[PDB]
Subunit: 40 residues, 3 copies
């Protein structure tokens, strides 16, 4: 299936972004490595 | 030059994450792999 | 800690997504590599 993403967050401690999914009981997420930094 | 992401979707079987780009003919996408899992 | 992504863009020539983050002076972002392409 194609599973819709509801919203995103990212964490500078873990260097993970997390997508909340519209699926099942509402507590599934998708997660991936990201860089995080203060820009200019 | 960066363009808006219109939406995110996530495949149920591969956990491939697809971002639909607002640009030109509307058929451009971005893609990456993710880990999907169930939380508390 | 997880902070909201307020905006999401993708850059075709760099193959990078940039997430803008709701934190601090508002210049925090997150970035990851992506495949970019035109769909059928
Ligand atoms: C965007 C920020 O990134 C790092 O500085 C973290 O220590 C914060 O919790 C926040 O996630």
């Amino acid at each position: 299936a194609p599973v819709p993403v509801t919203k995103l967050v990212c964490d500078g401690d873990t260097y993970k972004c997390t997508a909340y999914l519209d699926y099942g009981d509402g507590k599934w997420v998708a997660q991936w490595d990201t860089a995080v930094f203060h820009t200019t």
